[PDB]
Amino acid sequence: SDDLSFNFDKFVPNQKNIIFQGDASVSTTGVLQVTKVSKPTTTSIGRALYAAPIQIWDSITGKVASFATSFSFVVKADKSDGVDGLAFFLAPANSQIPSGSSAGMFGLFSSSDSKSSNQIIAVEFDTYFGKAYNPWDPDFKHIGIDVNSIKSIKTVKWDWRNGEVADVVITYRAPTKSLTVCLSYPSDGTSNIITASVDLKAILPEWVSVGFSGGVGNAAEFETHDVLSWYFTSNL
Amino acid sequence: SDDLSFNFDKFVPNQKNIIFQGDASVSTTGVLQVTKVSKPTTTSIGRALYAAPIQIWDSITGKVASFATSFSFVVKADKSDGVDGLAFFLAPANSQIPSGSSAGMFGLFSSSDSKSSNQIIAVEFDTYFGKAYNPWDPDFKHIGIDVNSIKSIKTVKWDWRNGEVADVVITYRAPTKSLTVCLSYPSDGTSNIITASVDLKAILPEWVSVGFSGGVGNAAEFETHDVLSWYFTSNL
Amino acid sequence: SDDLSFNFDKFVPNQKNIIFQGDASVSTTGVLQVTKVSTTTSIGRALYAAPIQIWDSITGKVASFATSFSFVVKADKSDGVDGLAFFLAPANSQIPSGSSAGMFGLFSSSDSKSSNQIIAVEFDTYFGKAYNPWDPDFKHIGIDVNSIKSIKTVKWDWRNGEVADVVITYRAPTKSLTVCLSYPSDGTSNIITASVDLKAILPEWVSVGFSGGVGNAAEFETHDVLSWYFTSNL
Amino acid sequence: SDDLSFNFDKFVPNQKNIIFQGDASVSTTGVLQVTKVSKPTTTSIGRALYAAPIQIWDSITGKVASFATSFSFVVKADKSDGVDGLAFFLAPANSQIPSGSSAGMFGLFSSSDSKSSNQIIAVEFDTYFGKAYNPWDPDFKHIGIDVNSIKSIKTVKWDWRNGEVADVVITYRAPTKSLTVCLSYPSDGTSNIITASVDLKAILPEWVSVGFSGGVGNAAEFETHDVLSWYFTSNL
Ligand SMILES: *[C@@H]1O[C@H](CO)[C@@H](O)[C@H](O)[C@H]1NC(C)=O
Ligand SMILES: *[C@@H]1O[C@H](CO)[C@@H](O)[C@H](O)[C@H]1NC(C)=O
Ligand SMILES: *[C@@H]1O[C@H](CO)[C@@H](O)[C@H](O)[C@H]1NC(C)=O
Ligand SMILES: *[C@@H]1O[C@H](CO)[C@@H](O)[C@H](O)[C@H]1NC(C)=O
Ligand SMILES: OC[C@H]1O[C@@H](O)[C@H](O)[C@@H](O)[C@H]1O
Ligand SMILES: OC[C@H]1O[C@@H](O)[C@H](O)[C@@H](O)[C@H]1O
Ligand SMILES: [Ca+2]
Ligand SMILES: [Ca+2]
Ligand SMILES: [Ca+2]
Ligand SMILES: [Ca+2]
Ligand SMILES: [Mn+2]
Ligand SMILES: [Mn+2]
Ligand SMILES: [Mn+2]
Ligand SMILES: [Mn+2]
Fold it and tell me: So where does beta-D-galactose get bound (chain C) (predicted)?
C-alpha cells in the first residue's frame, strides 16, 4: 500500500500522536482548537503537528511524494469579523514556532521576507487583510498558497461563512507538481478553489512535519480556528 | 477497511473489469476513449462502467455510502470548438444505453424530461450549449450536477482548455448529502468547482454501476473524450 | 493505492457484486451459504462480480494478493462432507460439466490437465479412499494447482461448528502462497506454504471466489463464509 | 479509512520516523539491524519504534483496536547457532529500554517476574533457550506470546532457518481477543503458527508505541537480527 495514511474522525484531550505547540489543544468535545478560546478572549498563536515526520522526497532515487489531505474546520467570530486565520502546512521535521512570530504570520514566519531557509509550504485561510498591519495581503479574505513567505504566490477570494463548517481537500500530484485546494460549505453550497505549481523537492527538506497553525492577533476581534477531523495520506 | 476501492493508472485494450457500451474502447496507448476517434470522424456515443455493481445504500440499516473518485481527462477538439461532452455517472446496476438516446444526453437519457424512474446521478462536462438543439443548457461550456434529468440542477462555468489534461476529484459525503466537484488544469492553474445537495437514497436504487459516458453529436465539430486514469472508493 | 481492494463484513440477500453459481446463496442472517442448507446433495460457487488482472503480459509483472475470511462448517453428526475452497479461475468461468462435490465444482476429472487453469486452497473434510483416492488419511488444507490432487497438504484440526479465521497471502517476488488458519474459540492453528508461479498457471484475467460441495446428504454439513476481505496489486 | 496505516519496503539511514534505542540502526543496504553487526562482534541490545504513538483502546467509548502487521526478517548466525532472539512489541508510549535489562529479555524487561506495571505485549522469536541462563524458556528455539513477562504464556517450536528470510504476519482481532502469529519461509516452505487470547485493554495503556527489539547476550555465539520491511495498520 501507500507509505503513510492516518485518519482522525475526532480528537481526544492530550492526543499523544499530535504535537501541540503554542496555545493549541483539544477540547473535551473532541475538537482541535489550534487557537485558544477562553473566558476573557486573548491574543493567541498555536500549532499542532502529527507526531511522526514524513518523507516527502528521496535524495537517493530522486522520487517526490504525492499526498492528499482532507479536513473540516470552523471559524466562528464574535462580531461579524475576526482575525487572523488558519493554515495547513509542511515544515522541516519537528520544527518549532519561530522566535518573534506574530498571529498574522500564523506562527510560521519570523519576518515578511521570502527567505529560502524558511523551508515552508502552507495553504492559508486568511481572515484579516488590513493594509496597516498585513500590507502583503489582497483586499479580501482569501485562500493562499504560501511558499517560503507570508506573501502568497497565488490567492483566491474566500467566501468565508461565519460559524459554518467548511470541508477542505488538498491534493499534491508529484508528476505535474500541481497543488490544488478544494473548499466547500455543505451548509449553502459555497465553494472556492485554487491551484498552483510547486516543486516540493526545491522548497522542502526530505523529512517534514505536517499540521495546522493559526493565530488571533487582536483579542477584540476574536474568532475560533477549530479543526473537526483530519485525514492524510502520502506516497513516494 | 472501506467497502470498495480500485485504481487504474492506465487502461489496457479490452480490459475485462470495464464494461464497454456503445463506441467506448481503450486505445493501444492505454487511454479510455469513451467517444470514438477515427480517420474520417463520425457521430458517436459510448459508456464504460466498472464491471461490478456497488452498494450505494442499505435498505436494512438505512445507511448511505460516502464515495470519492478521481480521474484525469482530455477533450481535444479539431477546430476551436467541439461537441458534445463527457460525464461521470451512477446508474442502476448493469444498465444499458437508453433506446433513442442522443450525444447531447450522453447516452444517459431517452428524453429531456425529469422522470423519477431514470434513477441517474451524473456530473457532466458539457461542451455544447447551442439553444437550437440543447435548450436546457446555460450560455457557456459548463460543469453540471444532473439528477434524473439532462437539465442540471446546478451548473458552473467550465473554463475548458483544448487538449489540456484536467484533474477531477468528486466527493460525496453521506452525512451532509454534499456532492462536490473539483476540477483543475495543472497546465495553467485554471480551476472550477461546484457543490450541490443530493440524497442518493432518494434518487438511486441500492445497487448501482459507476462509469463514464460521452457523445459526439456532429462529426463536423469533432473532439475527443479521453479519460487517462481513474480512482474510486466507496464505503457504507 | 493498490489495484483492487474490497471488504464484506456481512453479505446481503442477492448481493449484486457476487456471482452465484450452483446452489450458492446468502441467507437472511447475512451469511454466504456456498452449499445449500435445508437436506440434499449440493454444489455451489460464488465469485466476485469483476475479473482481476493477476499478471500483465506487456510488462511481465505478477500481482501480489492477500485475502481474509471467516467460515464455519457445522456437521449434523460428528462428521460431514465434502469441504470448501477458495480459488482463482479464468475470468467468468462456469461450473465444469460433470463435476462432483469431491471436486468442489472446480474439476471435471481427477487428472492434472494444464488447461484447467485453476489454483485453489481447499479445506477438505472428506477423505474416504473409496471415493477420494487422491486425498491423504485426514481432514486437510491443500494447495491445489490444476488438479484435485493437492501439491501439498497439512492436517486440518477442524472444529465442528466453530468459526475459523483464514488469511491467505501470495507474494509475487518469492512466489510464496501461505495459508494461515486459526480458531479463536480454542486457539487451534494450522498453517501451510507452497511455491506457485501464477504466471505459469493462470491467464491474465481471473475471477476469485469460494466453492464447496456436499456429496452425500446423509453426512450433511454447512459451508458458510461470514465475511471476506480481498486486495491485489500489480 | 482506518485509523493508521504505514508501510516501509526498505529502510533509510537515520530514518526520521523510527526512534532508535540502544544499538539499533539501519545499514546503507537499507535493512534495520536492531542488533549491532560489526567485526569484532560484540554484546548488544537495541530497539526501534515507529515515531508516533498509537491509540490501542479508548477509555471514553470502551472500544479496542484491531491491528495487523507484516514484516520479513533474517537471523544469520556465524556458527550453527546464535543468540538471543528478536521481538515485535507494544509498550507504553515512548518507553525507554528498562534499566538493567539483558539480551535474553530483549531490552523489554528489568527482571523475570510477571509485574503488572510492565505493560508489555510482545511476540518473541527466541533463539537461545539454555536452562542455565534462560530457565523460563522451553527446550527449543520458539515463538512466544509474552504478556508482562519474559516467560511466555504460550509458545510453539520455531523451525528457524539460518540466514533465510522469514515472512511474518501478526493479526489481533479485538472482538475475539485473538492474537495470531503466522511465520513462513518462502525458501523451503517451512511454516510455524501460534494463537493466544489477549485482552489489550487489560494489559496496555490507551497510547502505545510499536516496534522491534532484540539482543545478543554472548559475542561468541553471534547472529544478526535484521528486519527487511514492515507494514502496520490499526483501527479503533
Ligand atoms: C526568526 O526565526 C528564526 C528561527 O527561530 C530565528 O533564527 C531568527 O532569529 C528569528 N528572527 C528574529 C528577529 O528573532
Ligand atoms: C427511453 O429509454 C427507456 C429505457 O430504454 C425506454 O423504455 C423508452 O421507451 C425510451 N424512449 C423511447 C421513445 O424509446
Ligand atoms: C469437463 O469440463 C470441461 C469444461 O466444462 C468440458 O469441456 C469437459 O467435456 C468436461 N468433461 C466431461 C466428461 O464432460
Ligand atoms: C527495571 O526497570 C524499571 C524501569 O526502568 C526500573 O524502575 C527498575 O528499577 C528496574 N530494575 C532495576 C533492578 O533497576
Ligand atoms: O460418503 C461421502 C461421499 O459420498 C459420495 O457420494 C461423494 O461423491 C463423495 O464426495 C463424498 O461426499
Ligand atoms: O551463551 C549465550 C548466553 O550468554 C549469557 O551470558 C546470557 O546471559 C544469555 O542470555 C545468553 O546470551
Ligand atoms: Ca492576514
Ligand atoms: Ca449540452
Ligand atoms: Ca475430498
Ligand atoms: Ca531466550
Ligand atoms: Mn495572506
Ligand atoms: Mn448541460
Ligand atoms: Mn483434498
Ligand atoms: Mn522465550
Answer: 82, 215, 219
Q: Where are the alpha helices (DSSP H) in D114-234?
A: 200-203
Q: Does B184 contact A173 at a Cβ distance shorter than 8 Å?
A: no
State the CATH architecture for C1-234: Sandwich (2.60)
Mutate to test the interface with D, among C179, C189, C192, C195 (most CBs of D within 10 A): C189
Pick the CATH number of A1-236 from 3.40.50.2000, 2.60.40.10, 3.40.50.300, 2.60.120.200: 2.60.120.200
Contact C166, C180 (CB under 8 A): yes
Cell of C116: 484447467
Q: State the structure-solving technique.
A: X-ray
Resolution in angstroms comes to 2.8
Alpha carbon distance A117, A138 (integer Å): 25
Q: Identify the residue whose C-alpha is closest to ligand 2 atom 1.
A: B110
Q: Which of C49, C56, C58 sits opposite B51 (nearest CB)?
A: C49
The residue whose C-alpha atom lies closest to atom 4 belonging to ligand 1 is A98
Task: Parse chain B into domains and list their residue ranges.
Answer: 1-236
**Strand C52-53 versus strand C205-214 pairing type:** antiparallel
B167–A contact, CB cutoff 8 A: yes
Listed residues: CB within 5 A of ion ligand 9 = C 102, 124, 126, 132, 135
D62 touches chain A (CB under 8 A): no
Say if residues D184 and D161 touch (Cβ distance below 8 Å): no
Our CA dihedral for A168, A174, A177, A181, rounded to 10 degrees, sits at: 0
As a whole number of angstroms, the distance between CA C10 and CA D180 comes to 22
Q: Which residues of D touch C194 (CB under 8 A)?
A: 189
- Partner C contacted by B227 (CB < 8 A): no
Using CA atoms, how far residue A135 sits from A81, A132, A141, B5, in Å, is 18, 6, 13, 46
